[PDB]
Write a protein that binds this ligand. Structure first.
Ligand code: MG
Ligand code: ZN
Lengths: 45, 180, 299
RNA sequence: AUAUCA
């Protein structure tokens, strides 16, 4: 859901009215599952 | 007042004047350590005065651990005699004290943040990095570590009077920033 | 300007912008007639015109404080352009180009602030701290990834953006004692309340808990109950006291995890403060569930 | 730069 990252670290919900008054952006966070695999061969498998 | 700082450690240098074979030195000394791979010096020790010497191949030697200037020169002459006894053409020369450390207790807590703000150009205080305030005195040029407890450390002195001078100079300041 | 007719030391003069005149308020003599609109004149340098249609837009704004005075355009694609001449004239700019490239260490600071969630005012202080100390003989040969890691805490310590040194140890990199000495040779050229918002948020506590912890921690310091413990520990301990006092509790393990402190250490501060728990709490704190001052763990 | 006015 839409959130805001204030100057003092704290993140909290953000309603449309607070956005319009404090000139913020009514945006929410995008999160993606990332995986990092590793493989190796000697001088095909 | 009434408090006078106690000397805690004296560091000195001595030139033996001749090259040394460290394996030989380490082998013949009664209380020696020598691991070339870790540090390039024989770490020799004597019981009286209780000290530690760092002996190099160049013949230079660092003597540390003494609590008095007398003890420093005494222990230094002793280390030199050991080298002679082992067989090298060593000579006791250039004895010079390079660093003197002192400490005392003022018996009251100190407001380090206030002191750091007031004496900002000489002070350095980052309690999360190290709990004591580092005070860099101009005259004499001595470094003091000041703690909330009232314990004080003075270092960087070449002569005993400088330790005494610095404390005399700092005492009024410590008093101004007391807690009780 | 001063009126040639009157001459009184505080020269009372008005800028009648609307009539485009500069008048002496006393005698009324006009002291200047040519007068220019600075707002609209500044609109010609910093506009909204990115397309290129505005005939008024004729210049560009620069930053003489940060990049000195390096005026330089860039060869790029236009409407009628062959992709050949762009390459040649750009391959020709390569032979004319070291320190004019160390400005890409600003791109290292900008990408670090944005990875640390830092404001636009902090980057510009970190970039000015880095420009005035990266070529110093007083820094000589310090770890080059730990002198820009130290100039970010220098920029944060003026812009009032709470960032512990262990918070920048997580970013990059930092060798602790290495970027701690470098943070002092440049300096020659946090508190309990700082962490409380973030730690509490991660903790998932209410505003009520945060405020009380914040009040206790300050009082703890004011009281000087914790002689020299690190502020982070104090804060984590205070959070423990307040939270335990309220309904939604958090354990030492959970508080320590968020604060990045160890339970044993939180225990250490906590027990020191506990004795004066009464003095510590906000006055209109409402202990709930079953946790009154008497009942607090005391651990 | 968009919107708009006769
Ligand atoms: Mg008409
Ligand atoms: Zn006039």
């Amino acid at each position: 859901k839409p959130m805001v990252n204030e100057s003092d670290g704290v993140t909290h919900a953000l309603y449309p009215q607070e956005a319009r008054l404090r000139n913020l952006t009514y945006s929410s966070g995008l999160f993606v599952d990332v995986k990092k695999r590793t493989y190796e061969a000697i001088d095909e498998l | 007042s009434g408090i006078v700082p106690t000397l805690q450690n004296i560091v000195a240098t001595v030139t033996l004047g001749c090259r040394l074979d460290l394996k030989t030195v380490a082998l013949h000394a009664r209380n020696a350590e020598y691991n070339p791979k870790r540090f390039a010096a024989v770490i020799m020790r004597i019981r009286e005065p209780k000290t530690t010497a760092l002996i190099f191949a160049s013949g230079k030697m660092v003597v540390t651990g003494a609590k008095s200037e007398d003890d420093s020169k005494l222990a230094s002459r002793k280390y030199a005699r050991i080298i002679q006894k082992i067989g090298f053409a060593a000579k006791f020369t250039d004895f010079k004290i390079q660093n003197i450390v002192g400490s005392c207790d003022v018996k009251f807590p100190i407001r380090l943040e206030g002191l750091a703000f007031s004496h900002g150009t000489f002070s350095s205080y980052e309690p999360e990095l190290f709990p004591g305030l580092i005070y860099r005195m101009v005259k004499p040029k001595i470094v003091l570590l000041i703690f909330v407890s009232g314990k004080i450390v003075l270092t960087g002195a070449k002569q005993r009077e400088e330790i005494y001078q610095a404390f005399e100079a700092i005492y009024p300041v410590l008093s101004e920033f007391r807690k009780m | 300007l001063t009126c040639p007719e009157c001459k009184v030391y505080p020269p009372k003069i008005v800028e009648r912008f609307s009539e485009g005149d500069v008048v002496c308020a006393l005698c009324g003599l006009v002291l200047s007639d040519k007068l220019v609109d600075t707002r609209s004149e500044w609109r010609t340098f910093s506009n909204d015109d990115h397309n290129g249609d505005d005939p008024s837009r004729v210049g560009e704004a620069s930053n003489p404080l940060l990049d000195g005075n390096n005026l330089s355009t860039r060869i790029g694609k236009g409407e009628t352009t062959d992709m050949r001449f762009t390459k040649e004239l750009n391959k020709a700019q390569g032979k004319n180009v070291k320190d004019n490239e160390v400005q890409a260490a600003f791109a290292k600071i900008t990408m670090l602030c944005d990875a640390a969630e830092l404001p636009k005012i902090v980057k510009d202080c970190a970039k000015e701290a880095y420009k005035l100390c990266h070529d110093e003989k007083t820094l000589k040969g310090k770890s080059m990834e730990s002198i820009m890691a130290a100039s970010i805490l220098i920029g944060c310590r003026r812009a009032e953006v709470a960032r512990t040194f262990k918070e920048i140890q997580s970013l990059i990199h930092v060798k602790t004692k290495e970027f701690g000495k470098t943070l002092n040779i440049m300096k020659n050229i946090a508190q309990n309340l700082t962490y409380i918002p973030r730690f509490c948020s991660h903790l998932g506590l209410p505003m009520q808990v945060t405020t009380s912890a914040e009040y206790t921690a300050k009082k703890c310091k004011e009281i000087k109950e914790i002689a020299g413990k690190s502020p982070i520990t104090i804060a984590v301990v205070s959070i423990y006291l307040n939270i335990l006092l309220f309904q939604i509790p958090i354990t030492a393990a959970k508080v320590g995890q968020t604060l990045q402190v160890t339970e044993g250490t939180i225990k250490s501060g906590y027990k020191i403060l506990y004795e004066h728990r009464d003095k510590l709490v906000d006055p209109q704190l409402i202990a709930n569930g079953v946790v009154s001052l008497d009942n607090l763990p005391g651990v």
